[PDB]
Amino acid sequence: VARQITLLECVGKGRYGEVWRGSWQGENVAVKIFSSRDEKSWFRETELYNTVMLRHENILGFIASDMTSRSTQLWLITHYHEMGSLYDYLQLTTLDTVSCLRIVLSIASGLAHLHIEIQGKPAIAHRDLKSKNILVKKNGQCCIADLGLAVMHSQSTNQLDVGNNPRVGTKRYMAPEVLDETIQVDCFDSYKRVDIWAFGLVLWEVARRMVSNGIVEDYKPPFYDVVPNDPSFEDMRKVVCVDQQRPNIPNRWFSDPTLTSLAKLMKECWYQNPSARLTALRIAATLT
Ligand SMILES: c1ccc2c(-c3cnn4cc(-c5ccc(N6CCNCC6)cc5)cnc34)ccnc2c1
């Protein structure tokens, strides 16, 4: 309830606002303070968390949503994960096979839980999945954060709800059909397929940091070789759509069974034809 929270340190900041480590009732909590340029992401994330009832070990736990003064500020208050995002974590550690699979299996679980219509829930597509939007919990599982762009669908009414956030997704992770603008925006499956695309890119990021035969790759973001920091639409269009480039597989992965499997899963997330891509549920089944 925002007025009982002591802000301690900023652990994240971008055009969209800031995330703070705060103290609430003796526990670390995370406080996302939205920029005035991103108020509608606050609206959407608040909408999801207390109309849809997301409770799942692999989706960031919600505490509260509030307006407050500091001067009007929109606050989203969630669980704090001290290990930070998957993006930070992969830079500061290498993985063994067990902790690599635990990460990727938990992401797949959370994404499948979102995607599946059910104390039920509509089907949800995320639309901004990336290593920076995934937290690492102390038990080594991850959870998915940031529902500001989420879209919903119900089979009982066949109503698709896309909100009206003008926010654009992270360009680095956009699926080819997004970059060439042929995605069919009124069809809910279109959005599940872009989540799968982005999930393959994250899978690639994690796998690089798994040690096999005593070697490992450096952490890199997807497409690190071919686009600058902060690529434009046209930058990403040229790589993914025109040149049809996909992240390269390290040769050493084909000498390890687990990384060979993950390489195959990634492949099947990067089909140009979105309807060929695996589903979250099928990915999670393979990973067990
Ligand atoms: C997207 C991503 C996250 C959130 C979060 C969020 C929830 N918990 N959390 C923790 C951090 C964080 C903690 C510690 C560190 N360091 C110590 C470990 N090594 C790296 C530096 C870095 C980062 C950042 N954001 C969050 C809350 C609400 N919306 C989000 C949307």
Numbering used by the authors: 204 to 273, 276 to 323, 327 to 496
Paper text:
Upon ligand binding, bone morphogenetic protein (BMP) receptors form active tetrameric complexes, comprised of two type I and two type II receptors, which then transmit signals to SMAD proteins. Here, using hydrogen deuterium exchange mass spectrometry (HDX-MS), small angle X-ray scattering (SAXS) and molecular dynamics (MD) simulations, combined with analysis of SMAD signaling, we show that the kinase domain of the type I receptor ALK2 and type II receptor BMPR2 form a heterodimeric complex via their C-terminal lobes. Formation of this dimer is essential for ligand-induced receptor signaling and is targeted by mutations in BMPR2 in patients with pulmonary arterial hypertension (PAH). We further show that the type I/type II kinase domain heterodimer serves as the scaffold for assembly of the active tetrameric receptor complexes to enable phosphorylation of the GS domain and activation of SMADs.
In one ALK2KD mutant (ALK2KD-KK), two lysines within helix I (K492 and K493) were mutated to alanines; in another (ALK2KD-RRK), R490 in helix I, along with R485 and K497 on adjacent loops, were mutated to glutamates. Both ALK2KD mutants had greatly impaired ability to dimerize with wild-type BMPR2KD. In particular, ALK2KD-KK completely lost the ability to dimerize. The ALK2KD double mutant (ALK2-KK) displayed a dominant effect on the BMP4-induced transcription, almost completely eliminating the basal reporter activity. We also obtained crystal structures of the ALK2KD-KK in the presence of AMPPNP and the ALK2 kinase inhibitor, LDN-193189.
